[PDB]
Write a protein that binds this DNA or RNA. Structure first.
Lengths: 52, 52, 134, 52, 147, 124, 62
RNA sequence: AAGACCCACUCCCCGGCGCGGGGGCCCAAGUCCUUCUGAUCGAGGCCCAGCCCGUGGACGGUGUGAGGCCGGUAGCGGCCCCCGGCGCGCCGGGCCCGGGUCUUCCCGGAGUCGGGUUGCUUGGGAAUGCAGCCCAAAGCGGGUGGUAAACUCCAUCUAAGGCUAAAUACCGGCACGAGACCGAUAGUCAACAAGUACCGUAAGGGAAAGUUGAAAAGAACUUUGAAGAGAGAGUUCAAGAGGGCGUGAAACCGUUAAGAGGUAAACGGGUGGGGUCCGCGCAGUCCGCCCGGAGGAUUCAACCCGGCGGCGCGGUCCGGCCGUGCCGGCGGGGCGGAUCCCCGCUCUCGGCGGGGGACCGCCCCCCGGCCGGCGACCGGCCGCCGCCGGGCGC
RNA sequence: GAAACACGGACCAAGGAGUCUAACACGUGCGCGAGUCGGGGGCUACGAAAGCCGCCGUGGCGCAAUGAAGGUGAAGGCCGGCCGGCCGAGGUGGGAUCCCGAGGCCUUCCAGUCCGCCGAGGGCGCACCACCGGCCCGUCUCGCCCGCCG
RNA sequence: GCCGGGCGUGGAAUGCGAGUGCCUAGUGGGCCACUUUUGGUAAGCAGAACUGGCGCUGCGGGAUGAACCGAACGCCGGGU
RNA sequence: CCCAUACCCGGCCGUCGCUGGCAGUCGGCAGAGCGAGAAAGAGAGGGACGCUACGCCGCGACGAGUAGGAGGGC
């Protein structure tokens, strides 16, 4: 915690360094997709195959 | 991560000691294989000895 | 691992120094282990092999429990000739088959003034390793 | 020729990035198994032992 | 990485990507910047106008340190001092203006490009532009020269 | 996370073997042993493994408990089932369905247990 | 995505795409009438493309 | 520099004697049980010490592949020589030496500078440098002050005599270490009796050429022949390794077998015939469920005890723990800040530098309160459910 | 324009030809971002590596241009009596997206709300493009004024 | 030139998604034919215009064939 | 009446396009749907396969090539 620091506290053993920031917080997109907030905003899944 | 877990320190003979350490923030940094790979294949050239 | 920067670990350099070692260095490379009954009597692991030393072959086609003295130490070929370790040639004469000393255990030594002073030194410095470590 | 460009330089922040991604992946058991390390009996993955 | 280069894909194709009619010869047009006035005239006049000729006076022994004069615009004049000063100046009711010494920060001339926040300053500089002075006064500051 | 760790090991894994235009994963708890996101045996929080019993008779069902996720020495719970064929399948069917424990893998687990039980019976 | 799945109540913004220094070199070539396009010079100064193609005193200009 | 006046120690340097670096020799532990092999360094094992050593698991040797057979490797390991070092003490020596103030004196490098000119050189442009020829100095002078010249102020050095370590260079030499290099048409021309053989009057030019086997055990002897060469025999795991001998490709050739043959051969597409081998084909599918009759177990459901697991909207259980959340502070500290009394110094008061202290910000900690999570991260109860084990059930 | 009375080629094996360095340009990937970068230098077997050093960012490139040069060096409007207050960073057209909503979205019948959806029309308008103004430097023309130590 | 407002039966047919910016190789010997056409007695000659070919292209036909006529090509079965 | 690699029907391969579809494997905490010409709500007061999403799947159209360019090479 002093060689790289937390995100709210820069490193104490590096001159000016702090951990890189995440590009997305919740990487669990399985728990995201089946969350209610998203399911309400989705059209019906068209899953009937129409062959020639 | 919102909350960081509490790692337990183990004695020299295997069983868990009473002491615990908070998981440092660096273990929650983003995993970037493309960066680790890029840094590896470039830093690993620096120990090369010339031939001609 | 070795850390001495002046000691090589090159394959070609070690093989060149081995196959071109002078005679007094050939002697050292051609050392043999002592028997168990001799190893705790002198507290010495191994020893360069002389011309008249009782010997057992442990590896190869001539291995067995027979004791045989050395007859010559052919240092140029990195090999020794043991008295009964021989094979038949075509024309009925026998020839000493050569055995490598590393594949030979010494069962009795050819003691003399110079030989004894070697055994005690190999035993003196051996104790230093046990009096400094413990 | 000997003056071929043998060595490479990487940005210091990119080097520090990779060490953060390397350590952060050492805390995921699925990634350490996938590296082939037989660690199926280790008590806790961020293995910490006392200073003894 | 030669395994990604184009020559790996050109193995087996005779001309190696340089055509059969117009072979890849040594130097078909001359070496370097040759023919700048004769057969490469169009290229030099279409992409490097002004290349040929002399213009202006010569300065024999030029020392860049004499003409050294880094400039700073008024838009980032407040970035030289810490934010604590900029907020204590507006919070202050006495009317005391903070002093912003640019030559200490590394600039000599002050140019008036941006807009200034309405609170007085005391800009210590080596040179000023006319607009830079006019903007500083309008905010209520003062232009202090130094050498 | 699950989806994060998959993006790391989907191509670079010691358990991965790719040859003859086929891709396989030999990781310990991968029933159907294919390199997939569903059947991967290390990525998820809840995993089901079915391996032959040590004695050669029966199957071992391996469920992954949810408490200790970064503690591999206690993460997996192993139970041995040495009943007849029909009840052995009926047990693991209950252990997955009635527990709501990774239900997309019940039939895959019944297939695998059925293949292990069929191998253990005396070959003719 | 959780707060606004359909993007309702958002303002989609973009940076200045042609703000890169490269686009000053693009367009009609320099040395063309009214083609105020930055040329490629290794350094700027009185003796780097200030001559013949630029002064009316030296030949012509555009 | 000398004199005068104060001030200050009088101790260094030469010539003799005594009290870490190079070489040599050594230092851990399996040839332990079974089993492969021509040979094991292979394979398996060595429980409770899952053999033994390990500051030694570099490398090489050894009849394949060796931490423990050997040399070594590791060690702020040992021993013994040699080289100078480092002070100490003695003797013979040279050794009287400085600083400040005041007064009085002294002080500089010439066929050189500079100028003209010619030629070279330079980024140096009305000439940067160098050289020849001619001219040829000065002393408040001389040189420089990147545009020729005059005048006038400044600035700046002191040419034409000399010495001087370190940082720096090193395709030769001596001695070492290493490599994402080459692997015998490659790498040096040269892995070898290579600058050799050989060529040229000479200057010079300049190759090709590594490998039997673990070990010569290098084929005794018989037999045909003048002999080279064969046939036996023998050696070896192997002669299908027999002295230019590992592997032994292609072109080319011999022979054997098969097929074919007057539009040179070869080719594409389509079939047919014949071979070669293979399918180990030669009486042809199993897999569920149901029914039927023959059999055989310790056998089902349901309950009982025990263990484990899953989940809980327990509508909101209790307690921990954490926060990339926040607030509260008669808080505690560490810093950060271009936010504002003391000591020191140069001219008791003003100026300067340092140290507080105050404030702000941040972080850490002691709390208190919330908010959330523990599905990136928890325990106990409670309930439901599942599984396993053991009983019964027969 | 080659089956050519065009040239190379009897046959086999092995060797055998777009490379490296520097510079530049554009595209692309990554890190940081009005900054960025230690490359040089220091500090602490593999390791000649790696790590660290900003009171090692000197310096490079970027953040300002223009003129040969001396040089200069990047919005304004209104109100009140050249001064004092206020508003203070262009506009037009086209613009992906967002916003509003006239209305309109079934079980025995109406009344009947919340949510969700649709939509005439109307808006704020990203980037970018076209155009019109504005500002800085050079230069020209025409003028009126101001300022103070000399 | 500016504002503001009102007008949509989208004001011929047919077809079709468009616009736009970077970087850029090869080429810069051509040849042939219908029609038009210049020099020439003429030429499988020299030189142009227009379109299409050949070059870069096989296939069916013209016995043969760079260019003529038909027609342009993934690998196949049937039909025409 | 004969036949081309042209045209028609069918199979297969590939490319391109739809910037197509699929996270809904939503299971006694269950209810098995979005092929439907018509702006918008099946709205409240014990059960095969699958989904290396860089994957899988469905429709269409298309395929000559030197010099040259690019992509993909389990």
């Amino acid at each position: 915690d002093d060689l790289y620091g937390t995100w709210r506290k820069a490193a104490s053993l590096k001159s000016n360094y702090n951990l890189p920031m995440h590009k997305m917080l919740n990487t669990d997109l399985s728990r995201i997709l089946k969350s209610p907030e998203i399911q309400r905003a989705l059209r019906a899944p068209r899953k009937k195959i129409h062959r020639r | 991560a919102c909350a960081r877990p509490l790692i337990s320190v183990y004695s020299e003979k295997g069983e868990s000691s009473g002491k615990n350490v908070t998981l440092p923030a660096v273990f929650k940094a983003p995993i970037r294989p493309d960066i680790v790979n890029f840094v590896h294949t470039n830093l690993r050239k620096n120990n090369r000895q010339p031939y001609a | 691992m070795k850390f001495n920067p002046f000691v090589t670990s090159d394959r070609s350099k070690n093989r060149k120094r081995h196959f071109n070692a002078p005679s007094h260095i050939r002697r050292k490379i051609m050392s043999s282990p002592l028997s168990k009954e001799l190893r705790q009597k002198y507290n010495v692991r191994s020893m360069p092999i002389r011309k008249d030393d009782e010997v057992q072959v442990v590896r190869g086609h001539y291995k067995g429990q027979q004791i045989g003295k050395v007859v010559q130490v052919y240092r140029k070929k990195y090999v020794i000739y043991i008295e009964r370790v021989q094979r038949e040639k075509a024309n009925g004469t026998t020839v000493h088959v050569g055995i490598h000393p590393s594949k030979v255990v010494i069962t009795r030594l050819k003691l003399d003034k110079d030989r004894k002073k070697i055994l005690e030194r190999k035993a003196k410095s051996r104790q230093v390793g046990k009096e400094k470590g413990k | 020729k000997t003056w071929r460009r043998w060595h490479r330089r990487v940005n210091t922040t990119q080097k520090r990035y990779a060490i953060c991604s390397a350590l952060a992946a050492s805390a995921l058991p699925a990634l350490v198994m996938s590296k082939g390390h037989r660690i199926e009996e280790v008590p806790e993955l961020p293995l910490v032992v006392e200073d003894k | 990485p030669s395994r990604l280069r184009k020559t790996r894909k050109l193995r087996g194709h005779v001309s190696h990507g340089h055509g059969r009619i117009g072979k890849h010869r040594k130097h078909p047009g001359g070496r370097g910047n040759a023919g700048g006035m004769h057969h490469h005239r169009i290229n030099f006049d279409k992409y490097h106008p002004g290349y040929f000729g002399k213009v202006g006076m010569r300065h024999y022994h030029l020392k860049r340190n004499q003409s050294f004069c880094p400039t700073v615009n008024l838009d980032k004049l407040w970035t030289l001092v810490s934010e604590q000063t900029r907020v204590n100046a507006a919070k202050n009711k006495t009317g005391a203006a903070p002093i912003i010494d640019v030559v200490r920060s590394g600039y000599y001339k002050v140019l008036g490009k941006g807009k200034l926040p309405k609170q007085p300053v005391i800009v210590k500089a080596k040179f000023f532009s006319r607009r830079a002075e006019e903007k500083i006064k309008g905010v209520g500051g003062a232009c202090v020269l130094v050498a | 996370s699950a989806h994060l760790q998959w993006m790391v090991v989907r191509n670079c894994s010691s358990f991965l073997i790719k040859r003859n235009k086929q891709t396989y994963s030999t990781e310990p708890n991968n029933l159907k042993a294919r390199n997939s996101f569903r059947y991967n045996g290390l990525i998820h929080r809840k995993t089901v493994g079915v391996e032959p019993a040590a004695d050669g008779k029966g199957v071992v069902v391996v469920m992954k408990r949810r408490s200790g996720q970064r503690k591999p020495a206690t993460s997996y719970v192993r139970t041995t089932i040495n009943k007849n064929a029909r009840a052995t399948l009926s047990s693991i069917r209950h252990m997955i369905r009635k527990n709501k424990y990774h239900p997309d893998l019940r039939m895959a687990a019944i297939r695998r247990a059925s293949a292990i039980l069929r191998s253990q019976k005396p070959v003719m | 995505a959780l707060d606004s799945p359909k993007g309702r109540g958002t303002v989609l913004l973009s940076g200045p795409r042609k703000g890169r220094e490269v686009y000053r070199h693009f367009g009609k070539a320099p040395g063309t009438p009214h083609s105020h396009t930055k040329p490629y010079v290794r350094s700027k100064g009185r003796k780097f493309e200030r001559a013949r193609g630029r002064r009316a005193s030296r030949g012509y200009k555009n």
